[PDB]
Design a protein around this ligand. Structure first.
Ligand code: HEM
Ligand SMILES: [C-]#N
Length: 136
């Protein structure tokens, strides 16, 4: 993960970072078992909560932290440590993590011309999830 790839990803993310709700929607739609871990959304129709205030509040938190991580590549270890600390006790599985990745990438492909940033995003996400999976 070098500066050329980091700059490509950060340019790519800048286009979409203003649509937190859309990104979270994509992730929940890829794997409903992620959605079911939230007391505030469990048992509701995703299409119905997508536009409510609680969804936006959450979306802003999660994508806000992801935005931190993208902004500081590649010095992400301390933040991944924090993530593992808050999430390992909620029983997040590798399957769910991989579906989050799949949902995010699906979002990016449906909303930008992804083809030019694909390999850079690959390197970034392989590095990120590579670190998470070594800790939980
Ligand atoms: C895909 C598996 C994941 C599951 C099952 C999951 C689950 C949760 C749950 C249950 C909460 C608490 C919501 C609340 O009580 O209000 C939460 C919050 C949060 N999640 Fe995740 N999450 C996942 C992935 C991620 C990823 C990849 C990130 C990295 C950006 C992330 C960042 C956050 C942040 C920043 C919060 C708010 C602070 C906190 O409560 O921990 N989550 N998540
Ligand atoms: C966490 N989403």
């Amino acid at each position: 993960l070098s500066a050329d790839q980091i700059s490509t990803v950060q340019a790519s993310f800048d286009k979409v970072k203003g649509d937190p709700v859309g990104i979270l929607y994509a992730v929940f739609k890829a794997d409903p078992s992620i959605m079911a871990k939230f007391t505030q959304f469990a048992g509701k129709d995703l299409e119905s909560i997508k536009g409510t205030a609680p969804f936006e509040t959450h979306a802003n938190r999660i994508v806000g932290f992801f935005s931190k991580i993208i902004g500081e590549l590649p010095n992400i270890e301390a933040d991944v440590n924090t993530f593992v600390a808050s999430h390992k006790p909620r029983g997040v599985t590798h399957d769910q993590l991989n579906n989050f990745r799949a949902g995010f990438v699906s979002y990016m492909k449906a909303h930008t011309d992804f083809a030019g940033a694909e390999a850079a995003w690959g390197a970034t996400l392989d590095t990120f999830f590579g670190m998470i999976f070594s800790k939980m």
